[PDB]
Design an enzyme around this catalytic site. Sequence first.
Site: not given
Ligand code: ZN
Lengths: 723, 720
Positions: B365, B379, B462, B520, B522, B685
């Site tokens: 972020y 993740d 997410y 942030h 991805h 994003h």
């Molecule tokens: Zn996002």
Amino acid sequence: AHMVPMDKTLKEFGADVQWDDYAQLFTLIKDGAYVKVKPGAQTAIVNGQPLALQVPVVMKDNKAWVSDTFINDVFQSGLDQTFQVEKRPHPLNALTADEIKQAVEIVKASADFKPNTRFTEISLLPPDKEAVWAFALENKPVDQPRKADVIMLDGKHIIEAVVDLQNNKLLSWQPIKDAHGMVLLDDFASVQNIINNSEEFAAAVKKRGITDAKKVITTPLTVGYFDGKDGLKQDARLLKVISYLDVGDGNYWAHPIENLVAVVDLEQKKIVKIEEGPVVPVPMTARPFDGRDRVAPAVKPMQIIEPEGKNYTITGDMIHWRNWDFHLSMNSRVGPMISTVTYNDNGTKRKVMYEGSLGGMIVPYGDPDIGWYFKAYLDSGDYGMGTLTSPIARGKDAPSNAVLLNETIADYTGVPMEIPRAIAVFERYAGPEYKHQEMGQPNVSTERRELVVRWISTVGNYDYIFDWIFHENGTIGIDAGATGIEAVKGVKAKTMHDETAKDDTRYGTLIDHNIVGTTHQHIYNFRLDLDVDGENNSLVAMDPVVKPNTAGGPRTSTMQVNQYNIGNEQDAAQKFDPGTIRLLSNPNKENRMGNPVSYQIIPYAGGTHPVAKGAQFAPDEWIYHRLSFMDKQLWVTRYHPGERFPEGKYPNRSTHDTGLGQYSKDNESLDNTDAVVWMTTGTTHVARAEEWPIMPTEWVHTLLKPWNFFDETPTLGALKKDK
Amino acid sequence: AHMVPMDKTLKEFGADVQWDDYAQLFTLIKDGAYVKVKPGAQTAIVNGQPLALQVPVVMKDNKAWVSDTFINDVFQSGLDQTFQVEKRPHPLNALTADEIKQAVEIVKASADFKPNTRFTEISLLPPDKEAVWAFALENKPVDQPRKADVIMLDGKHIIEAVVDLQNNKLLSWQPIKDAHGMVLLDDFASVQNIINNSEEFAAAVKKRGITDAKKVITTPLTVGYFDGKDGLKQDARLLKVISYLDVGDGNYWAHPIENLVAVVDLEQKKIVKIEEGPVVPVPMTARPFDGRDRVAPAVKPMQIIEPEGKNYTITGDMIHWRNWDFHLSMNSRVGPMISTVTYNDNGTKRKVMYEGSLGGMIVPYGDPDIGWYFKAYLDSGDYGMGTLTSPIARGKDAPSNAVLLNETIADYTGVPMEIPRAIAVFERYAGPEYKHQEMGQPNVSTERRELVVRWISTVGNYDYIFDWIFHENGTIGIDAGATGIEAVKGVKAKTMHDETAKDDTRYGTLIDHNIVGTTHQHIYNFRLDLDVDGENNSLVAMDPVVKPNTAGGPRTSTMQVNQYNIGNEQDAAQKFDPGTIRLLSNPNKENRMGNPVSYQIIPYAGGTHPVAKGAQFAPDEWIYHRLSFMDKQLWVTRYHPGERFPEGKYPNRSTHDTGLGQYSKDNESLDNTDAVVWMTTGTTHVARAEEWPIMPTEWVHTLLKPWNFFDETPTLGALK
Ligand SMILES: [Zn+2]
Ligand SMILES: [Ca+2]
Ligand SMILES: [Ca+2]
Ligand SMILES: [Ca+2]
Ligand SMILES: [Ca+2]
Ligand SMILES: [Zn+2]
């Protein structure tokens, strides 16, 4: 009078026919009609509704038979709701066959018409956009009478007449000095003959190893402009002529006669010049692409079916689907036009796009030899892509659940032509609209539907597919695909081990024995008159940046955005870095959070070939100087009724940019005014063996996304809790 | 003697039941099975084939009944050919439930095994790649026994063991010095209880205008590494705790408690630090994403039917389809693995890819404030994306024509879990494969079919989707989608006309009243051990360029290609310019034209969100130092057994880059050798109102294209 064999007439008529011996049930599909019918049954089923049959389907000795009236009784039933009849005609409806024949009759009645006078374009002259919006949004009749633009080619001379069809009178008739006409259908023919009657050219051909010559296929190409360096008079009407041998494989493109070019004067109807370079033996091996030498695969069927009919309605040319409304029409030059696009937001239709369509395209090569130096197709401006639309192959060019529209345009003699299967409309599953699976909770997910409007046009060797894609959530996609047959150069090398390899492959890949896929570009441009929730808009830039952290804590940097307006046409003409955001906003209208309602403009959303950063020509190249649209991905220009082509209205032998270069040159203010967005997306095509003898379809995508246009996820659905 | 209710038991079985009154016909669909049956008929039809019934279907009170033996007799009848039995197991098959329970026993049998030990990962240790390749190409059995990697977490201590399943022996017990373990399921529970039993924390919560501290939902986050500047001891097992307020809408994410961060030590089982910043009222309005407050518009049905069955065959995990052959495995960490991928070229299987999978991903972020500055989701590596697989919602997450697969892995207590509908396999129409409408001639068209292997994994807020897309013509695509619920920051401003609005949106857009969607990225990384038509390959650039014309005539310029080898790992780690061509070539084999067989690697083929030209971090940020794979779109490393993750094996609180940084560190040569390709694609994003309270699925695309691998259009078909 006897009845008629079922399976036979149904195929003629173009319906899909399935027989299920177990169920003893026919299933007949055509566009929005999904029909079930059993032999000897009382009623058939149309989109889930019963239809009385006076005469039930008959099975004899395994041959099925129906009434002479069956096709009409079933298909034109009205139980298929897909098509409805327009009450008040839309002001942007294309000219009818009648209206066309009328416009031609009006011009033929003026003093100056002459029988060799061909027609390069016969199109509706739209009323002013304001009256057109008021019609779409407010149902206000348009007062101005139906006019039509008629562009004639008098030998080599262009004239623009304007006719009034309401009053059946001629309004304008001005000659257009120094403008050349586009290529027309008879031009192809004249060029094949002139070449066939050429005593010289047969001898030219004879020496390059040929024999026969009845077997020479020509293809017409425009000559562009080289400030005379090509030795070609600026005011003659000319085409260069590239030739291939016909070897009987149905693919003459595979057998170039290389380093032979002929220049033809169409007025004179003869060859004025023959450029001859080194003799290169004509590649002779058969390379059919239609499968004549191939094994048919057995494939198990796959059917996309919609048994209760479609979710869209087609009223005249108006298409209604979920929250979208729009008008679809056809133009002989650029093909489909998508107009008065509104998104219904909780009851109110909000303007999205007044008019959108292909603007123009170019495919220019980068070999310098005689057969290639001037070679550059302006497919739409120079060949007329609408006119050359390729009827959709049902089930293959479009999915089995498509509806295929017929569209009508004037041919080049001003006689109406109906193009069968000109545009495909189809809804399609496009993964999850959205999903969230919270840990230990019921899953949430809904499905995505896009409505695709698809159009194909083939110009000589290449075939181009355009999809206008309407997401339910407000996003609009535009993708261009390319397939068909590559323009290949004849060369001496069989493999890269041959002595000529390095020199043969300098300008393209050796994709077959003796065959090189000359490198080039595919450059499309879209003209998008986006009226974002209204006429007056502004162009906003948001560049994400990494800025130093000046707020304490352990971080050194932050992700911030530099937001600034782009206030004129000159700055609006730019390269697109996909890391940034470009928004056409309405500074007069904000969403619930006080953000200006807008659309995010993305001229590059990816593609399957490498992407052109810009035009692959030095800045000193004539093609570079006349076609500015090639070097920038994003343009925004003030709206003006006449400015419509990225390449200019008469790009054949044009001497200067008359397109996007011209429209932005006066550098008008783009602050709170009617904008028009142009998107250029190009690829650089370095070929490979996988793409020969037929290039598998390759794609580029562009996108237009609602950006704070709405208050929330647009696909959440109708609200219950309060209002 | 005993009939079951048809609609009831068939739906319990997972089939779809359609009655059509007009033909008096049932259509029963499930996975590859397409069944048609008439009431009272003595035969049925499965995939276009006739089946004799023992007991005809009976209608009664206009309800249908079937023999208790019907489902088995119809669906397990063998007429559905989609699934075939695997008589010789492929050597990359994942650990079975039994092998899992076994491997757990071998380690529980050692004296070193401590009482409350958890299992971060339990997976097959594959035999060497050359033997695997020989099984799939020459049917050569692997000499080696079934072994497994068993990685354990003894409180906070990582231990790596290897066990021999065939011989029921333990092979290694290696304590991993300094490694932190990934976040395990129970760590989520701990955190909530520890916050619940906190005097200090209930207190802080009350200041922030919360009444009932039981409506407070915790979320666990790795804390990363900042060389001391966050105040956190390197040795303690830590988690930071962002907190939201459950208000009854089922969307606790929509309700942050901004600037309240707790730091929990899981071994001490307590809070060890409460960072508090300014006070922002919890945004309160109900924002559900589940439809409780909506009514869907009526939709006409769409079906994608394959009434004679599928073109693919699934034999155990081996999938066959047209000219493609490959192996599909599930890993608890990175999800699906695509292995031994060959293309059948006119009868001869040529190697394309030895193994492909997600390598790792990160969602870091842009905000520096108290509750954001450390927020970065690895993740797969920190949470276990395989383990967190979200079962496919039939017909919604995948089309109605998919076949859905169950996949088995080990939970964190070493007990096997079967993930229903873990993976979707389906064929689809992707438009015309090629077309030429030559003028005045009969048109030529063929339809494109793509086979997609789709997996969805959800990690907190997410949800991510991976499609592995095989094209008949030899292209492979890999797309990544993202949906679900954005991480939002609570702020004072309602609209952009408010005082704080400017300050409030310095690090993200105002997407709801009092809600800012912080910016942030991805970033996804794919590890692709490509073996282009054999082991030994080279990396070759082809930069298209304009050059001055020297051949004469009126052109001042030409379109040419700059070609050159890229000889080492260090030059191979680079930014990708979508205008250039990068190939992994095999310098020992060439097509009919003398060009070496190659694959075009395209790490950026487009996306629906803006693209990052690299990490949106200054080069001296700790996340940047740690996670180098963020800032280059292409890597190529020499293949070695233990190099699987771009973020590194143990990336929780790592002090240096133990992944792609480490792998290319030693700058190995890439000339005529076993290469592994890593593709990094990523987005920046910037949020918008349209993505709230749930984000419509966004996509990014990557592509691998054959480049002179074949001698012609590979979809023309064989010669007669
Ligand atoms: Zn996002
Ligand atoms: Ca506009
Ligand atoms: Ca202007
Ligand atoms: Ca390899
Ligand atoms: Ca290395
Ligand atoms: Zn091309």
